[PDB]
Design a protein around this nucleic acid. Structure first.
Length: 82
DNA sequence: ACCGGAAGTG
DNA sequence: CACTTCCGGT
């Protein structure tokens, strides 16, 4: 799953240059959109992956209450731990 | 950047 | 299903 993959990355320091926790409890910011996508596209063997396609995937999680967007902030989503 | 509909995949 | 692909919107 993607939200899995995100968390997989987010509990490893060796990717803080790419993606890390910021602001509130469950908030996280993608520092390098294009790189992340490349890695997810490596993992899913989909070479033609990019943030546009990944970001759509994320928005589908809004209805499913796993994620939502922190408005105003760039590349900043937040998990639904409630 | 960020959204969400729409059609396709295995 | 859980995305990927595409694209015309805000």
């Amino acid at each position: 799953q993607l939200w899995h993959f995100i968390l997989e990355l987010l509990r490893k320091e060796e990717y803080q240059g790419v993606i890390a926790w910021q602001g509130d409890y469950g908030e996280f910011v993608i520092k390098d959109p294009d790189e992340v996508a490349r890695l997810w596209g490596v993992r899913k063997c989909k070479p033609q992956m990019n943030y546009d396609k990944l970001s759509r995937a994320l928005r589908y999680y809004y209805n499913k209450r796993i994620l939502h967007k922190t408005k105003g902030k760039r590349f900043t989503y937040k998990f639904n731990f409630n």
